[PDB]
Scaffold this active site. Structure first.
Site, PDB file in Angstrom:
ATOM      1  CG  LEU A  56      -1.952  -1.197   1.306  1.00  0.00           C
ATOM      2  CD1 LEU A  56      -2.795  -1.055   2.282  1.00  0.00           C
ATOM      3  CD2 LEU A  56      -3.268  -0.574  -0.038  1.00  0.00           C
ATOM      4  CE  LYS A  66       7.502   2.258  13.881  1.00  0.00           C
ATOM      5  NZ  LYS A  66       8.990   1.313  14.407  1.00  0.00           N
ATOM      6  CB  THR A  95      -0.927  17.774  23.539  1.00  0.00           C
ATOM      7  OG1 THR A  95      -0.923  16.554  23.078  1.00  0.00           O
ATOM      8  CG2 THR A  95       0.755  17.686  23.942  1.00  0.00           C
ATOM      9  CB  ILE A 100      -1.185  22.594  26.466  1.00  0.00           C
ATOM     10  CG1 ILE A 100      -1.969  23.350  27.776  1.00  0.00           C
ATOM     11  CG2 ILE A 100       0.037  21.790  26.666  1.00  0.00           C
ATOM     12  CD1 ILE A 100      -1.484  22.810  29.010  1.00  0.00           C
ATOM     13  NE  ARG A 143     -17.922  13.905  17.048  1.00  0.00           N
ATOM     14  CZ  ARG A 143     -17.708  14.237  16.220  1.00  0.00           C
ATOM     15  NH1 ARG A 143     -17.092  15.265  16.094  1.00  0.00           N
ATOM     16  NH2 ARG A 143     -18.522  13.021  14.639  1.00  0.00           N
ATOM     17  CB  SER A 174     -18.493  17.104  11.551  1.00  0.00           C
ATOM     18  OG  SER A 174     -18.566  17.555  13.095  1.00  0.00           O
ATOM     19  CG  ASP A 184     -14.996  22.777  16.311  1.00  0.00           C
ATOM     20  OD1 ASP A 184     -15.650  22.192  15.285  1.00  0.00           O
ATOM     21  OD2 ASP A 184     -14.117  23.255  15.888  1.00  0.00           O
ATOM     22  CG  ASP A 248     -12.957  27.936  15.375  1.00  0.00           C
ATOM     23  OD1 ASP A 248     -12.308  27.108  14.448  1.00  0.00           O
ATOM     24  OD2 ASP A 248     -13.227  28.377  16.246  1.00  0.00           O
TER      25      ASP A 248
HETATM   26  N1  LIG Z   1      -4.462  20.268   8.618  1.00  0.00           N
HETATM   27  C1  LIG Z   1      -6.045  21.211   8.142  1.00  0.00           C
HETATM   28  N2  LIG Z   1      -5.425  21.316   6.738  1.00  0.00           N
HETATM   29  C2  LIG Z   1      -6.808  21.365   6.299  1.00  0.00           C
HETATM   30  N3  LIG Z   1      -7.465  22.077   6.246  1.00  0.00           N
HETATM   31  C3  LIG Z   1      -8.261  21.830   7.925  1.00  0.00           C
HETATM   32  C4  LIG Z   1      -6.939  21.597   8.313  1.00  0.00           C
HETATM   33  N4  LIG Z   1      -7.550  21.216   9.867  1.00  0.00           N
HETATM   34  C5  LIG Z   1      -9.090  21.462   9.351  1.00  0.00           C
HETATM   35  N5  LIG Z   1      -8.757  21.904   8.076  1.00  0.00           N
HETATM   36  C6  LIG Z   1     -10.671  22.079   7.976  1.00  0.00           C
HETATM   37  C7  LIG Z   1     -11.047  21.186   7.243  1.00  0.00           C
HETATM   38  C8  LIG Z   1     -12.028  21.172   8.495  1.00  0.00           C
HETATM   39  O1  LIG Z   1     -13.301  19.886   8.460  1.00  0.00           O
HETATM   40  C9  LIG Z   1     -12.584  22.500   8.597  1.00  0.00           C
HETATM   41  C10 LIG Z   1     -12.792  22.641  10.563  1.00  0.00           C
HETATM   42  O2  LIG Z   1     -12.102  21.956  11.193  1.00  0.00           O
HETATM   43  P1  LIG Z   1     -12.085  20.661  12.077  1.00  0.00           P
HETATM   44  O3  LIG Z   1     -10.894  20.687  13.314  1.00  0.00           O
HETATM   45  O4  LIG Z   1     -13.659  21.636  13.057  1.00  0.00           O
HETATM   46  O5  LIG Z   1     -12.881  19.851  11.690  1.00  0.00           O
HETATM   47  P2  LIG Z   1     -13.808  18.988  10.973  1.00  0.00           P
HETATM   48  O6  LIG Z   1     -14.561  18.462   9.821  1.00  0.00           O
HETATM   49  O7  LIG Z   1     -15.021  19.784  12.140  1.00  0.00           O
HETATM   50  C11 LIG Z   1     -14.012  17.421  13.118  1.00  0.00           C
HETATM   51 CL1  LIG Z   1     -14.572  15.783  11.893  1.00  0.00          CL
HETATM   52 CL2  LIG Z   1     -13.283  17.819  13.688  1.00  0.00          CL
HETATM   53  P3  LIG Z   1     -15.277  17.851  14.270  1.00  0.00           P
HETATM   54  O8  LIG Z   1     -14.641  18.782  14.454  1.00  0.00           O
HETATM   55  O9  LIG Z   1     -16.720  18.498  12.894  1.00  0.00           O
HETATM   56  O10 LIG Z   1     -15.557  16.413  14.502  1.00  0.00           O
HETATM   57  O11 LIG Z   1     -11.233  23.038   8.640  1.00  0.00           O
HETATM   58 MG   LIG Z   2     -16.664  20.540  13.359  1.00  0.00          MG
HETATM   59 NA    NA Z   3      -3.347  21.354  22.654  1.00  0.00          NA
HETATM   60 NA    NA Z   4     -12.801  24.418  14.521  1.00  0.00          NA
HETATM   61 NA    NA Z   5       3.449   1.110  -2.361  1.00  0.00          NA
END
Ligand SMILES: Nc1ncnc2c1ncn2[C@H]1C[C@H](O)[C@@H](COP(=O)(O)OP(=O)(O)C(Cl)(Cl)P(=O)(O)O)O1
Ligand SMILES: [Mg+2]
Ligand code: NA
Ligand code: NA
Ligand code: NA
Length: 327
Positions: A56, A66, A95, A100, A143, A174, A184, A248
């Site tokens: 993969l 591992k 963390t 943090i 949640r 989400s 969030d 946010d």
């Molecule tokens: N490192 C990244 N790179 C690109 N896009 C990102 C990144 N991090 C976040 N985003 C984008 C994409 C991300 O979808 C959006 C909201 O960030 P959430 O941390 O709230 O993600 P979520 O899907 O809402 C979740 Cl499944 Cl964690 P929920 O909190 O609902 O359970 O920001």
């Molecule tokens: Mg979210």
């Molecule tokens: Na943290």
């Molecule tokens: Na977020």
């Molecule tokens: Na491969």
DNA sequence: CCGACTGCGCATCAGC
DNA sequence: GCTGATGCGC
DNA sequence: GTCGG
């Protein structure tokens, strides 16, 4: 892709990802572990050898062996050593407090501060975000029922319109991927006078209204185009109080809503894969634009793409509805 | 061997 | 006081 | 850690 099919392996790989990101401060090994875990979780057979997982993409020599030790013993000696390590496992627990990060956690654990209670005793050592993340430690790990998301959408959409009826506000993350619960609330905001022209107070005066009706309760970071904070559902009767929730708000050039709503939808691992293979075709996507990569690493001008996708078939991909982007 | 690896705003740190 | 770097969480 | 120059 049936969860328990290789969940042991992907658990181990996710647990290694976390140790790398929180303890070794090796954000690249972290991403590599997260990519091996993801691809294996989609694989439609049960791995019985590291050599089988090696075929993969993203699985290599070290992960393959591992997998073999895990397969043969049920355990990983590195993990079991790591979990048993009071310094490593403290840093990992710390963390989980919003604000943090891995460097903060080490500095705290170095000077003896290892628990949440250690943290409360030492709030002078905490910046603004960390005290809030510590204030609401339990709440931020709960949640959000989709039904509470919709009530939060009501307040946001109601109070936003009260300020200026040409604001558009869009709950992404989400939630917009149809998730029955969310971590969030992610709010995308566009206003016609924000494009390439501008007057930049559009976000502040939306935050302020949401605070005025006591929806938003705390502030973690606030800027020209990005607010991160805490928000609570108003309660009734003698009810239990709802939990505090992380919200946010992100304010995008209306001219660039489509790239904004794709990024914010996303999911995050889905964005990493879409952008990564936008690279393979010689494009670069971000929350703003999609750009070609010219002779080598160019940009210069992008197209103001007109459709909810096009972003999507520019990279020769078959459109994934937001339900199909939690991957 | 070796460097790229998805992409970025705000808070704070480092330094002049 | 400023600029520029880094940590942090999207 | 993995992949590719
Ligand atoms: N490192 C990244 N790179 C690109 N896009 C990102 C990144 N991090 C976040 N985003 C984008 C994409 C991300 O979808 C959006 C909201 O960030 P959430 O941390 O709230 O993600 P979520 O899907 O809402 C979740 Cl499944 Cl964690 P929920 O909190 O609902 O359970 O920001
Ligand atoms: Mg979210
Ligand atoms: Na943290
Ligand atoms: Na977020
Ligand atoms: Na491969």
């Amino acid at each position: 892709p049936q969860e328990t099919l290789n969940g042991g392996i992907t658990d181990m790989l996710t647990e290694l990802a976390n140790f790398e990101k929180n303890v070794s401060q090796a954000i690249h090994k972290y991403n590599a572990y997260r990519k091996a875990a993801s691809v294996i979780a989609k694989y439609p057979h049960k791995i019985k050898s590291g050599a089988e997982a090696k075929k993969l993409p993203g699985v290599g020599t070290k992960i393959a062996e591992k997998i073999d030790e895990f397969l043969a013993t049920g355990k990983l000696r590195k993990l079991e050593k790591i979990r048993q390590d009071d310094t490593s496992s403290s840093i990992n627990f710390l963390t989980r407090v919003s604000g943090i990060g891995p460097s903060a956690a080490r500095k705290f654990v170095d000077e003896g501060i290892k628990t949440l209670e250690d943290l409360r005793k030492n709030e002078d050592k905490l910046n603004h975000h960390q005290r809030i993340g510590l204030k609401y430690f339990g709440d931020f790990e709960k949640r959000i029922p989709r039904e509470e998301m919709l009530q939060m959408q009501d307040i946001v959409l109601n109070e936003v319109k009260k300020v200026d009826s040409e604001y558009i506000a869009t709950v992404c993350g989400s939630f917009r991927r149809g998730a029955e619960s969310s971590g969030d609330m992610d709010v995308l905001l566009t206003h016609p006078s924000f494009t390439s022209e501008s007057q930049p107070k559009l976000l502040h005066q939306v935050v302020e209204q949401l605070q005025k009706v006591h929806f938003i309760t705390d502030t973690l970071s606030k800027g020209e185009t990005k607010f991160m904070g805490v928000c609570q559902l108003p309660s009734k009767n003698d009810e239990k109080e709802y939990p505090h929730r992380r919200i946010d708000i992100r304010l995008i050039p209306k001219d660039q809503y489509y790239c904004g709503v794709l990024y914010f939808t996303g999911s995050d691992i889905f964005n990493k894969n879409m952008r990564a293979h936008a690279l393979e075709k010689g494009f670069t996507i971000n929350e703003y634009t999609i750009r070609p990569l010219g002779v080598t690493g160019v940009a210069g001008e992008p197209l103001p793409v007109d459709s909810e996708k096009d972003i999507f078939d520019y990279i020769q991909w078959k459109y994934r509805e937001p339900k199909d982007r939690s991957e």
